[PDB]
Design a protein. Structure first.
Lengths: 214, 218
């Protein structure tokens, strides 16, 4: 396959720097430039930087000009975006792209969060059902974590049907919070257990919360 | 700068129907026969996917029901037939002269029959109340269309300013939305009142549904 692997994201202080990387496989076409595109939370795509197929000529968005360096190592088949004097307006998911014509191969993205806020693990509370209809609803509230992201599965991924995991919400405190819910047969509340699996990697927090009625 | 204006901003369309997104460039994007205009599809929580490159070359692996066209300034991505999986934001992008620039995006909703939400209210856990805060969650589940209103009332006082809601992306499986409104209070305030309720208004309900509890009672 022709994959791109994006590394070096994470939480950074205002005025600090970042250095992202992009590794590749099998292309190596030689007529194909390397791009960096970013996406600010809840917004569209913004072009950041570009390095031409042969090295010579780089290029930058005016928002980032002076502060960014795009380079490529032809031997390791890897590109880099270094960027300095970072502000909160640089907080975004940085995408790495490559191709000849358009941008046909993308990496999955890497979140850079510019903030002097502290990393904080979530508290995970149940959304317990009634105590009554014909179908029950239950969930987990993941409160007061920073930065993003957080990951919620149910019964270690064995329960996928009826699950709605909601987008995170930035609270007035500056901490994030999200809810994940699942609708299940009320007849199976007695028999089967429902555990939400939360993981907030940034804080090393990994929690299993069982949800029962009461 | 080649400014790309993309219209319309949002667009709901039925399965089988034709959806036409257009992109207008502030100046020409052409050299000889070639027009350097690309189309990307971003489903949420995912990187953009190349659909059409250089005006009208359908990217390999993409189905033929997608097709791009246009010259100079005016370009159009058409989808026909539209399908439930085509929920996404679509982006035009120019690669004629630096800086490379994208359009603002166009958000494609899928249409379907009206579906009322199933409303659930969740009181705060004893767990949470031990700490400073009380979070009360109202869940509107599997409804169409997206437009719904949630109203929190605490001992008959309409709350506003202390509620926050988010909405799932359209289910594709059944093309519904779901939505959670989360009312946040101090422990103190939470024990100062008895009756907590969310009233949901929605098109598929013949009059607003209210789900509530009284603090304490099972």
């Amino acid at each position: 396959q022709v994959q791109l692997q994006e590394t070096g994201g994470g939480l950074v202080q205002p005025g600090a720097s970042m250095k992202l990387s992009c590794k590749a496989s099998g292309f190596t076409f030689t007529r194909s430039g390397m791009y960096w595109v970013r996406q600010r939370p809840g917004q569209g795509l913004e072009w950041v930087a570009w390095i031409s197929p042969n090295g010579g000529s780089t290029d930058y968005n005016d928002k980032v000009k002076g502060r960014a360096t795009i380079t490529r190592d032809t031997s390791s088949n890897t590109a880099y975006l270094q960027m300095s004097s970072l502000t909160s307006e640089d907080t975004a998911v940085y995408y790495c792209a490559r191709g000849w014509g358009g941008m046909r191969y993308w990496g999955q993205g890497t979140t850079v969060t510019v903030s002097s806020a502290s990393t904080k693990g979530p508290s995970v509370f149940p959304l317990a059902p009634s105590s009554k209809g014909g179908t029950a609803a239950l969930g987990c509230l993941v409160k007061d974590y920073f930065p993003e992201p957080v990951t919620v599965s149910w019964n270690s991924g064995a329960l996928t049907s009826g699950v709605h995991t909601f987008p995170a919400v930035l609270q007035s405190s500056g901490l994030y919070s999200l809810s994940s819910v699942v609708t299940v047969p009320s007849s199976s509340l007695g028999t089967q257990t429902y555990i939400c699996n939360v993981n907030h990697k940034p804080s090393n927090t990994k929690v299993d919360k069982r949800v029962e009625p009461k | 700068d080649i400014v790309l204006t993309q219209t319309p901003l949002t667009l709901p369309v039925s399965p089988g129907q034709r959806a036409t997104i257009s992109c207008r460039a502030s100046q020409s994007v052409d050299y000889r026969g070639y027009s350097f205009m690309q189309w990307y599809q971003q489903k949420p929580g995912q990187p953009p996917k190349l659909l059409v490159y250089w005006g009208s070359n359908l990217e390999s692996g993409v189905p033929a029901r997608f097709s791009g066209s246009g010259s100079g300034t005016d370009f159009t991505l058409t989808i026909h037939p539209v399908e439930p999986e085509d929920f996404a934001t679509y982006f035009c992008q120019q690669s004629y002269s630096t800086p490379w620039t994208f359009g603002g995006g166009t958000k494609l909703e899928i249409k379907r029959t009206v579906a009322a939400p199933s409303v659930f209210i969740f009181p705060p856990s004893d767990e949470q109340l031990k700490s400073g805060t009380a979070s009360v969650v109202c869940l509107l589940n599997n409804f169409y269309p997206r437009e719904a209103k949630v109203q929190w009332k605490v001992d008959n006082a309409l709350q506003s300013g202390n509620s926050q809601e988010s909405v799932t992306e359209q289910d594709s499986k059944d093309s519904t939305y779901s939505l959670s409104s989360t009312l946040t209070l101090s422990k103190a305030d939470y024990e100062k009142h008895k009756v907590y309720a969310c009233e949901v208004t929605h098109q598929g309900l013949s009059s607003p549904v209210t789900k509530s509890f009284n603090r304490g009672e099972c």
